[PDB]
């Protein structure tokens, strides 16, 4: 049988400016233009999410070198504190292990960090290592990750675009456009009117069939979300996303019940592990779960989260994670379409989602992506040599 290499060393680097950390941006970007958030109730933190620190972490790069010379890697959000965790804590569970010990390594990472993990940063870190491991395994086997995950179930991926210009997204071939909500509860009725006006304007431009969705980034309360959803019915809003904070399971269940018949309620990008998603599904909190592969626990855990959704006959549409989501969703019956975040400042052109960190990163063409483009080993990308890496720790 094939001689399986062992893991020689694990390394963590930090990278800043775009890439995995969607919000690690500069000035003039739609993704930081008055997005409604839980902090919006404070005027001083309403115009910019960066002002309250959404960009304090940056990107965590994890590299895993095997005894055969192969090197797998992945990028996610975490930066220096995450690098500390990788170098000082998690490395011990990987070094010396066979590259195929995926399930065992994940279990040790999760159980060993349980005392300060469960959700958030620690899970982001575990996800990063996990992705790097799958990248390495793919490289060792000389096959793309989708083939290690049961194979694709569709010949191409179809995308909806997230950004402030759903009208421009339609012209680019996308199947729908998810817009950021710009006004929250603290802006009262005037803000609600402005929210609905924005949706109305886009509906007029795109026609009655193009999909339109609202992303609320955990910024509303039950009543406001209920009224926004009801008011959006007139414009055929397909779904309302992350209306409430992730810990409010009860509120999501109520919102889904009070929502217009046919309109979906989605959430999950800030939820983690099979247990977090079990709570969402069992309490009937949403119609679509949206875990981020780089934050929910990685591919190993997403496989379990996905199977849970399968049993619940629920749709799983991961929070756009570049090739990390593309390789995964291609193999899932429960993920008929995918999210493509428009990282161009004015959302007026398609650019790689994790630009400029990944070389070889495919992007939708007329809103689609042929599976044939994901034919390289692992996740099929290489780290851009132009991105200055920083290794804050060693072990």
Residue ranges binding Mg ion (CB under 5 A): 215, 241, 269
Q: What share of the chain is helix, strand, coil (3-state, %, to 5)?
A: 40, 15, 45
Q: Which does 85 bind (CB under 5 to 8 A by kind): its own copies, Mg ion, none?
A: its own copies
Q: Which does 274 bind (CB under 5 to 8 A by kind): its own copies, Mg ion, none?
A: its own copies
**Closer residue to its own copies in complex, CB, 331/346:** 331
How far does CA 359 lie from the centroid of its chain? 19
Listed residue (218, 214, 249) closest to 233, CA to CA: 214
CA distances from 352 to 306, 359, 361 (A): 26, 9, 6
Residue 123 phi/psi, 5° resolution? -70, -35
Query: Which is it for the CA torsion 128, 121, 392, 356, positive or negative?
Result: positive
Q: Is 223 left (phi over 0), alpha (psi -120 to 50) or beta?
A: alpha
Name the minimum Å distance from CB 28 to its own copies.
Answer: 22
Task: Round to whole Å and give the CA distance between 341 and 352.
Answer: 9
Name the minimum Å distance from CB 151 to its own copies.
Answer: 4
Do the Cβ atoms of 180 and 218 come closer than 8 Å? no
Q: Helix (H, G, I), strand (E, B), or coil: what is residue 97?
A: coil
Name the minimum Å distance from CB 217 to Mg ion.
Answer: 6
Non-local CB neighbours of 193 within 8 Å, separated by 6+ positions: none
Q: Which does 35 bind (CB under 5 to 8 A by kind): its own copies, Mg ion, none?
A: none
| Residue 183: burial class (beta carbons within 10 Å; 0-12, 13-18, 19+) | buried
Name the minimum Å distance from CB 203 to its own copies.
Answer: 14
Which residue among 29, 146, 182, 319 is the active-site one? 319
Q: Which does 222 bind (CB under 5 to 8 A by kind): Mg ion, its own copies, none?
A: its own copies
Identify whether 395 is a catalytic site residue: no
Residue nearest Mg ion, Cβ-based: 215
**Closer residue to its own copies in complex, CB, 129/218:** 218
Name the minimum Å distance from CB 110 to its own copies.
Answer: 9
Q: Which does 215 bind (CB under 5 to 8 A by kind): Mg ion, its own copies, none?
A: Mg ion
**Closer residue to Mg ion in complex, CB, 72/180:** 180
Helix axes 102-113, 121-141, angle to 10 degrees: 170
**Closer residue to Mg ion in complex, CB, 63/215:** 215
Name the minimum Å distance from CB 75 to Mg ion.
Answer: 19
Q: Which does 142 bind (CB under 5 to 8 A by kind): its own copies, Mg ion, none?
A: its own copies
Q: Which does 116 bind (CB under 5 to 8 A by kind): its own copies, Mg ion, none?
A: its own copies
Do the Cβ atoms of 166 and 176 come closer than 8 Å? yes
Q: Helix (H, G, I), strand (E, B), or coil: what is residue 320?
A: coil
Name the minimum Å distance from CB 255 to its own copies.
Answer: 11
Helix axes 273-282, 298-311, angle to 10 degrees: 20
The number of beta carbons lying within 10 Å of the beta carbon of residue 150 is 11
**Closer residue to Mg ion in complex, CB, 22/210:** 22
Q: Which does 122 bind (CB under 5 to 8 A by kind): Mg ion, its own copies, none?
A: its own copies
Name the minimum Å distance from CB 383 to its own copies.
Answer: 19
Helix axes 102-113, 298-311, angle to 10 degrees: 90
Do the Cβ atoms of 60 and 131 come closer than 8 Å? no
Non-local CB neighbours of 242 within 8 Å, separated by 6+ positions: 215, 216, 217, 218, 266, 267, 269, 270
Catalytic residue annotation: 319
């Amino acid at each position: 049988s094939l001689s399986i290499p062992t893991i020689k060393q694990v390394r963590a680097f930090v990278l800043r400016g775009g890439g995995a950390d969607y919000h690690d941006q500069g000035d003039g970007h739609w993704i930081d233009d008055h997005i409604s958030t839980p902090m919006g109730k404070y005027p001083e933190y309403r115009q910019s999410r960066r002002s309250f620190g959404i960009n304090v972490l940056g990107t965590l790069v994890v590299e895993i070198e095997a005894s055969d010379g192969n090197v797998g890697f992945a990028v996610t959000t975490g930066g220096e504190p995450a690098a500390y965790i990788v170098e000082k804590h998690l490395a011990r569970f990987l070094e010396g292990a066979r590259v195929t010990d995926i399930e065992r390594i994940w279990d040790q990472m999760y159980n060993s960090t349980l005392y300060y993990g469960r959700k958030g940063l620690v899970i982001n870190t575990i996800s990063g290592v996990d992705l790097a491991l799958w990248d390495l395994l793919g490289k060792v086997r000389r096959e793309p990750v989708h083939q290690l995950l049961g194979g694709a179930v569709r010949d191409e991926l179809q995308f909806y675009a997230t950004g402030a210009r759903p009208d421009l997204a339609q012209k680019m071939g996308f199947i729908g456009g998810k817009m950021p909500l710009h006004h929250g509860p603290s802006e009262g009725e005037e803000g609600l009117k402005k929210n609905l006006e924005e949706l109305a304007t886009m509906r007029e431009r795109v026609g009655p069939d193009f999909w339109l969705m609202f992303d609320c980034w955990m910024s509303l309360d039950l009543n406001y979300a209920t009224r926004l959803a009801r008011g959006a019915r007139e414009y055929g809003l397909k779904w309302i996303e992350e209306a409430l904070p992730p810990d409010d399971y009860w509120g999501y269940a109520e919102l889904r019940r009070n929502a217009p018949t046919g309109m979906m309620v989605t959430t999950g990008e800030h939820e983690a592990t099979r247990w977090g998603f079990r709570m969402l599904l069992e309490m009937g909190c949403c119609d679509i779960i949206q875990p981020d592969v780089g934050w929910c626990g990685g591919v190993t855990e997403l496989l379990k989260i996905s199977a849970l959704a399968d049993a619940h006959n629920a749709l799983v549409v991961p929070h756009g994670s570049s090739v990390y989501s593309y390789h995964f969703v291609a193999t899932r019956q429960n993920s008929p379409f995918a999210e493509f975040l428009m990282m161009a400042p004015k959302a007026d052109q398609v650019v790689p989602m994790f630009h400029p960190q990944l070389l070889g990163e495919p992007v939708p063409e007329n809103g689609r992506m042929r599976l044939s483009r994901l034919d390289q080993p692992g996740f099929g990308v290489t780290l851009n040599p132009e991105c200055q890496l920083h290794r804050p720790y060693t072990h």
